[PDB]
Write a protein that binds this ligand. Sequence first.
Ligand SMILES: [Mg+2]
Lengths: 30, 33, 211, 115, 359
Amino acid sequence: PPERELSRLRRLYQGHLQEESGPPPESMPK
Amino acid sequence: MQERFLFPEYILDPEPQPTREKQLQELQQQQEE
Amino acid sequence: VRPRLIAELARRVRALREQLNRPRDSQLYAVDYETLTRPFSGRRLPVRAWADVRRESRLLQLLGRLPLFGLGRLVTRKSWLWQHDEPCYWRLTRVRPDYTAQNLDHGKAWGILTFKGKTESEAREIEHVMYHDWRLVPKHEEEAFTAFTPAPEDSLASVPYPPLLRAMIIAERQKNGDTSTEEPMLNVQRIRMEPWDYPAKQEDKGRAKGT
Amino acid sequence: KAYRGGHLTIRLALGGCTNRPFYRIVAAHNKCPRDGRFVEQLGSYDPLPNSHGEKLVALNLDRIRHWIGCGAHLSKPMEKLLGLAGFFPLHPMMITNAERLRRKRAREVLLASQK
Amino acid sequence: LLSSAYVDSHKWEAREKEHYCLADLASLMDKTFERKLPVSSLTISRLIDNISSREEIDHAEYYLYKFRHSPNCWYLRNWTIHTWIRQCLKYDAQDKALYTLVNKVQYGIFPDNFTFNLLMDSFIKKENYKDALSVVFEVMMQEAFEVPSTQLLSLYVLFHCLAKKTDFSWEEERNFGASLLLPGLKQKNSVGFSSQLYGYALLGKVELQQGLRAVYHNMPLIWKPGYLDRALQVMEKVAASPEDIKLCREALDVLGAVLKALTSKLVEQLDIEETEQSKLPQYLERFKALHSKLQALGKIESEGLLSLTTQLVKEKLSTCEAEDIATYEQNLQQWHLDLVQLIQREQQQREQAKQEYQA
Ligand SMILES: [Mg+2]
């Protein structure tokens, strides 16, 4: 997501936020 | 909209506590007779 | 079958009691700000609303301080301001306050909706009038607030079918003799993704029953 | 029976025995009991792998399409099954759960490397 | 400040008045409220229009409160509000008019600009600038600065009250800043731009110290941060304007003082955006640069704000008053026509109800 939308979500859910997740691994790790 | 004038001298107030119970009692009576 | 008359009597008297004990907005939508509970029912508001309930204003808390209850004025919502960058507001056309309220801060309103810069044709009733969410657009700011340039809203007009449905459609075509190599497509320009926070029809909404 | 409102929904009715579940895909009134009266049986689903290492799903696609066209809703497990079959798009939560699992396995691999 | 012709009440005294005894109308309204029926706007119009004493002012206040909390509350007619303020000024009850205006929610008193000017000018003529300032703040809260006469009177009163003030409460700063910004934005002269700058400086101080919600909550102000940036934008605008427009040294001093004092709960802003507290040093640098630019261009007035506003008033108020008086007379005739139409409609509906009751 663009950073502006992520900041919007952080304002909306301030105080109830988990660590942001990055893109998943390309394939299933073994 | 426009203002609708109401005139208290030409208005009749409502009667609370309507007693349909007596009507039902009359019905069950007449059945009993 | 012995006719059940007491059932009819009970239904009629209950209906009469309901129609003669209809609660008003000032009672239904009052709130205790210390405990954040509705005194009418005793139910607590959801947690995610709590902050706004203590910070923002109901619509008629704003309109009762305006001449003619603010017909023609623009009102926006905090949630819209936080969610959307494009202007979202109601242009008020009719207001009917709850006269029993001490501060005339409850009631109903009608207006024309502009959502994300798109205005509607007609005026309809506003939902969430009792929410602590509303803001009044200053008159010296309206021109800056309403300024919107419609961006090109060019979205996808067709999508692929799911794999199995696509295979079945192609098989049916091939069985009926058609040898067309054109991919089957599903038309979605007619399906317009309506945002979940777009105002609903307040006319169709129900009301809390007195008790 | 007459219910106040409600709708038809295509869902999974659970039968079988203890520790051996089996599902019947049925179109039924949403207010009816899970394993009770239904309008039509639209298929079946065995969640246990068989001797060939397969999970067997039977779908009456014609009747499923008919009942969806008659206004029937779909439960989330049924939507996921139809996505796995390719009859629908993959449900968003299957994709999201796959990504969550990928991230968890990546964290475990990173732990192994760190040790 | 307003002439005798503007404040003359002869024309309103000559309005067509159908006489009633206030006691009878009061009893009729009391019965109507007892029966939980709606009172017509014509009844309250007649009660307000037949006040003949200072105690009848007190009674009419109570019945205004009752009409406000009744089904027909929004049908309160503009001639009724104008007559209410006229009667209050007539029977030495300006505190009552000001009370109903301040508590406008409970009484529904929303005057037109002519009536605001009348009340404010009475307070000024008796040198009660505290109550005139209260009326100015009410004009600000109702956003009724659409007429130049009101703008000029409000600016005069505001600068008069500011010239003798040292201790500022943040609520007072907010009220003063809004009350100076709103009329200032409509005046395209030196006084208007100086007022814009002064009010932006005050609102920026309030924003930086008490937060932006302190600025915009329950105010005719925007919820967008950067009030000091808007002050500096006013300075830039004055730099690139015609020669005639200048900027007062007093407002520039106020903005400089605010910046020097500033450089010495929910989060409403996006975390990707820079806060104003982190922009204060650049604001100070821009202020110094623009101040030097304005001095070099000679775009600074040395005259005080109050003297400049006095001169502007003595230049413009007469024409404003003439236009206002023409509009007032036209409104008086329109009110006469509307009242006659309302009375005729009242007669018609009374007749219709009579035949229904006879049937
Ligand atoms: Mg049962």
